[PDB]
Symmetry: C2
Subunit: 283 residues, 2 copies
């Protein structure tokens, strides 16, 4: 019955012997190998000695050393393991990459390490909800996400953008949404209004800073059936009307089919408060 | 059944005749008086004609003209009604002041009007949760709150600060929290660590931007029992330890009793992972 947990305190004689034994790459009574303890203590010298003895040719079915090394602040074991030929896109038993754990541990230097290797790693995961990009968004880690976006090539269109927007609006992360909105605006190649799915959610919560930030951008106020809410809350109704009025005088928007044949003007004309709001927007 | 809803169209003759009648200050079939419709329309000239005929000496129990005028963007009727001697601190049938409705409508000019008159108005309401100040916080209206704080005299300590912080952290309003935190720091006359009740809330949610903003201030990391959470999540545990370590080197904090006799050092020293983190801060 074996216990390796104290391996980092062993001297040469005991380690050398151990590494000669038939036990050297077995898991102990706690279920961990020697590589696991060396990594956990950031024992670079020991890690390498284990690697020199053939530890990576004898990994168990539940051990993912790269994923483990990704939680360390010192990136050296991660460098060593990549040099040894470990695959940076491998999933563990929870469908996560090593990058995911660098995000989850907030190790920026390890995040930058994997992303300089290939930026595509930020979008690998068993599910969309298991990608390093989405997890950064979900954690409201504005630094990591700002960094991720600076590394997406223009040649690429973010697919998972709608799930990100949802969780962001839902949980009130306004700086995050500004980042996502700046990115949508800058990659708006067909020059249309921005489709924000959960604008209804921000209305219902009435987060004034969130709404004010949304309305700074060329958002699609029409494909949300927002005309239904113009008689609901006047402060918000005024923001929508102000936007609509702007869209009717902006050459970028005034001749769009969505603006021309809108169902808002109908509701505005039938009500008196809304009419007041409109004409006060016009100057 | 009498109906006054068109009154804003009436001409002087019909109006002059109605103001002579015994019906002049009754509510109609819809339940509204003439002043109500005039106000709703922002019909300043008609409001004044109604005031001149004695409308304010004949208010019914459910009539709150100032609260109604506060929802208008034009502040003129609010000015008129205050000249006529209406009480700016009166509660309506819901325990709210007129200022509450200026906040709820987002009318900054009306907010500034009531506050220049009497800054204390921002803290009047049936309950703490009905104050204009709390309502602005709950709406995440950072502009209104930023304005309100600039108008609190140093001679005053804000009482409701507790519930404002709760709602802010519960709902992820980082810029709001930053406002409240700068205010707390500015008025920290006892030069103590900041007491932040819902710290455990931001830990459970793991909002990285919220936690990073919280940890920039001299917050009380000790009166939360946080040592409990040091073995839970390593990214967060590391922010706590970094802070604690700084508190032991800062002359502002190192000789505080709460720091000296802390329950964290215990837990730090018993765990290898924790001592790892501790020693890396410590350089």
């Amino acid at each position: 019955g074996m216990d390796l947990s104290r391996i980092n305190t062993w001297k040469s004689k005991q380690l050398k012997s151990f590494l000669s034994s038939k036990d050297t790459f077995k898991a102990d009574v706690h279920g961990h190998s020697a590589s696991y303890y060396a990594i956990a203590d950031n024992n670079v010298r020991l890690v390498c000695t284990l690697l020199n003895a053939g530890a990576l040719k004898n990994l168990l079915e539940n051990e993912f050393p790269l994923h483990q090394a990704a939680t360390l602040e010192d990136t050296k074991i991660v460098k060593i393991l990549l040099f040894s030929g470990l695959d940076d896109s491998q999933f563990d038993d929870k469908g996560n990459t090593a990058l995911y754990y660098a995000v989850d541990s907030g190790n920026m230097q390890t995040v930058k390490l994997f992303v300089k290797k290939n930026w595509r790693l930020m979008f690998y995961g068993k599910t969309g909800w298991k990608t390093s990009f989405y997890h950064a968004v979900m954690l409201n880690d504005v630094s990591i996400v700002s960094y991720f976006l600076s590394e997406i090539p223009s040649t690429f269109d973010l697919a998972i953008l709608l799930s990100c927007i949802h969780i962001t609006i839902k949980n009130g992360h306004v700086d995050m949404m500004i980042l996502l909105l700046d990115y949508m605006t800058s990659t708006n190649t067909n020059n249309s209004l921005l489709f924000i799915p959960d604008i209804k959610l921000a209305i219902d919560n009435k987060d004034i800073e969130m709404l004010q930030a949304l309305f700074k951008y060329d958002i699609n106020i029409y494909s949300a059936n927002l005309e239904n809410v113009l008689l609901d809350d006047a402060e918000i109704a005024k923001m929508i009307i102000e936007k609509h009025v702007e869209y009717k005088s902006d050459s970028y928007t005034k001749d769009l089919d969505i603006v021309k044949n809108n169902k808002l003007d109908e509701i505005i004309s039938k009500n008196k408060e809304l009419r007041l709001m409109y004409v006060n927007c016009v100057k």
